[PDB]
């Protein structure tokens, strides 16, 4: 009758994007004017990305493919101090096309860059147009630093969902893990080759979290769902970046199917009470609405079947 | 934070 769902995971793992998908799928969605509201966010995410790339060229010591880009780089920061002009667009277009910044871009594993960077930049002509209005996908691609607990309600298959986006508190934690029906833990598959910021690979940090989750006594009666997310970025990434960067003891081949399977085990093996509790793993793309719909529909079935079994119905 | 909390 009532379901308390919890979204846990490392930063930029897909938690908040899943939330948007819930409103898109089990609520109204996104109106014309709601999308217009993210226009500023989109422009922001675009600018900070190209900048991050350009900044990285300073550390990594990478030259442009044309000294004429030095001027555009200059103007980028200058113009940033002022929403999308027609001049800034060209400044970014010219930079994004330069073989110089493109080389630094393909080395984004050595610094912090937005995952939606290429998405926006490769579609700049459209976004930069005056009176442009963000598509629903554009909205999903945005990155917003969500802080604090974020409650969200929706009804699906005759169930009232109370979904919490956990992304500083003290006793507020206690009043959060109280009788959680199910936990959806998000993992960014593509974060396996991200450099050592700290002394533990991003992926290893995620395993750390998941370990404490499914093994904790708090969730002995909680359905544990594992969302191996960003499979789309991972599929392309694995072709050029060895999984051994994350797990050096990995003897498998650098294919999507095999490498993904390996990562699934590394997480599922963190389950100590394997005899008592099962982990429901899904390979997802949080920005893919059709996929999230399918995956969440599957999750709901699991939750229903477990609501019955308990109070003796199944 | 909520990690060490556990
Ligand atoms: N390509 C791709 N991008 C994703 C996926 N999941 C999330 N993203 C993007 O990565 C960023 C993740 O941000 P978000 O999920 O809101 O942060 P979190 O709540 O702290 O995990 C967003 O800008 C999304 O557009 C995915 O499965 N595939
Ligand atoms: Mg967030």
- Using CA atoms, how far apart are residues A253 and A298, in angstroms rounded to an integer? 30
Closest CA to A8 of A187, A132, A153: A187
Residue finishing a domain among A145, A171, A193 = A145
Residue finishing a domain among A110, A128, A145 = A145
- Using CA atoms, how far apart are residues A223 and A299, in angstroms rounded to an integer? 9
Using a CB cutoff of 5 Å, list residues around ligand 2, an ion.
A 16, 146, 167
Cα A111 to its chain centre, rounded Å, is 17
What is the interface size between A and B, counted as CB pairs within 8 Å?
A: 14
For residue A18, give the ligand nearest its CA: 1
Helix or strand run (H / E) with residue A241? none
CB atoms within 10 A of CB A63: 13
Cα A7 to its chain centre, rounded Å, is 12
A210 and A63 in one domain?
A: no
Cβ density class A103-141: b for 16+ within 10 Å, e for less: bbbeebeebebbbbbebbbeebeebbeeebebeeebbbb
| Domain interval for residue A244 | 1-30+146-314
Virtual CA dihedral for A295, A297, A300, A301, nearest 10 degrees?
Answer: -100
For residue A114, give the ligand nearest its CA: 1
Q: Return the residue of B nearest to A147 by Cα.
A: B1
Tell me the CA distances in angstroms from A245 to A141, A185, A187, A203, A242, one per residue in order: 27, 23, 17, 10, 6
A26 and A73 in one domain?
A: no
Contact A110, A195 (CB under 8 A): yes
Contact A166, A176 (CB under 8 A): yes
Virtual CA dihedral for A157, A160, A164, A169, nearest 10 degrees?
Answer: -160
Q: How far is the CA of A308 from the centre of ligand 2 (A)?
A: 33
Q: For A227, which DSSP code?
A: E
The alpha helices in chain A, defined as continuous H runs, are 15-26, 32-37, 39-59, 69-80, 86-97, 99-105, 117-121, 124-128, 136-141, 202-215, 231-237, 256-268, 289-310
Question: Which of helix, strand or coil describes residue A162?
Answer: strand
- Using CA atoms, how far apart are residues A122 and A93, in angstroms rounded to an integer? 9
**Cβ contact B2–A169 (<8 Å):** yes
Q: Is the dihedral of CA A214, A218, A221, A222 positive or negative?
A: negative
Tell me the CA distances in angstroms from A297 to A156, A193, A292, A293, one per residue in order: 9, 31, 8, 6
A162 and A135 in one domain?
A: no
Cα A184 to its chain centre, rounded Å, is 13
A167 and A120 in one domain?
A: no
Strands A182-188 and A149-156: unpaired
Q: What residues of A are in the B interface, CB distance below 8 Å?
A: 8, 166, 168-169, 173, 176, 208-209, 212-213, 216, 218
A135 and A38 in one domain?
A: yes
A281 and A180 in one domain?
A: yes
**Cβ contact A173–B3 (<8 Å):** no
Closest CA to A184 of A233, A129, A223: A223
A159 and A130 in one domain?
A: no
Residue finishing a domain among A124, A145, A166 = A145
Contact A263, A240 (CB under 8 A): no
Q: Which residues of B touch A208 (CB under 8 A)?
A: 3
Q: Which residues of A touch B6 (CB under 8 A)?
A: 212-213, 216, 218
What single string gives the DSSP state of each residue in A268-303? Answer: HTT-S-TTT--EEEEE--TT-HHHHHHHHHHHHHHH
Query: What φ, ψ does residue A72 adopt, rounded to 5°?
Result: -60, -40
Return the CATH number at A207: 3.40.50.300
Q: What is the resolution of this structure in A?
A: 3.0
For residue A137, give the ligand nearest its CA: 1
Cα A250 to its chain centre, rounded Å, is 25
What total number of domains does chain A contain? 2
Virtual CA dihedral for A69, A70, A72, A74, nearest 10 degrees?
Answer: 170
- Using CA atoms, how far apart are residues A92 and A206, in angstroms rounded to an integer? 34
Pocket of ligand 1 (CB under 6 A): A 9, 11-17, 115-116, 140-143, 146, 167, 186, 229-230, 232-233, 285-287
Which protein residue has the closest C-alpha to ligand 1 atom 26? A230
């Amino acid at each position: 009758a009532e379901v308390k769902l919890l979204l846990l995971g490392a930063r930029e793992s897909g938690k908040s994007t899943i939330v948007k998908q819930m409103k898109i799928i089990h609520e109204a969605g996104y109106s014309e004017e709601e999308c217009k509201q993210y226009k500023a966010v989109v422009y922001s995410n675009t600018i900070q990305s190209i900048i991050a790339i350009i900044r990285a060229m300073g550390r990594l010591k990478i030259d442009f493919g044309d000294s004429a880009r030095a001027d555009d780089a200059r103007q980028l920061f200058v113009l940033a101090g002022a929403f999308m002009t027609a001049e800034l667009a060209g400044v970014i277009k010219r930079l994004w096309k330069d073989s110089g910044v493109q080389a630094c871009f393909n080395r984004s594993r050595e610094y912090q860059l937005n995952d939606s960077a290429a998405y926006y930049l490769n579609d700049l002509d459209r976004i930069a147009q005056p009176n442009y209005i963000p598509t629903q996908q554009d909205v999903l691609r945005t990155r917003v630093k969500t802080t604090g607990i974020v409650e969200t309600h929706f009804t699906f298959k005759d169930l009232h969902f109370k979904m919490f986006d956990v992304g500083s508190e003290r006793k507020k934690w206690i009043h959060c893990f109280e009788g959680v029906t199910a936990i959806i833990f998000c993992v960014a598959l593509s974060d396996y080759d991200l450099v050592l910021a700290e002394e533990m690979n991003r992926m290893h940090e995620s395993m750390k979290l998941f370990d404490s989750i499914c093994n904790n006594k708090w969730f002995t009666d909680t359905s544990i769902i594992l969302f191996l997310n960003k499979k789309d970025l991972f599929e392309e990434k694995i072709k050029k970046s060895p999984l051994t960067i994350c797990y050096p003891e990995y003897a498998g081949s650098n294919t999507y199917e095999e490498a993904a399977a390996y990562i699934q085990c590394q997480f599922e093996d963190l389950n100590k009470r394997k005899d008592t509790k099962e982990i429901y793993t899904h390979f997802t793309c949080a920005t893919d609405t059709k996929n999230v719909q399918f995956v969440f529909d599957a999750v709901t079935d699991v939750i229903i079947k477990n609501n019955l079994k308990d109070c003796g119905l199944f | 934070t909520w990690y060490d909390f556990l």
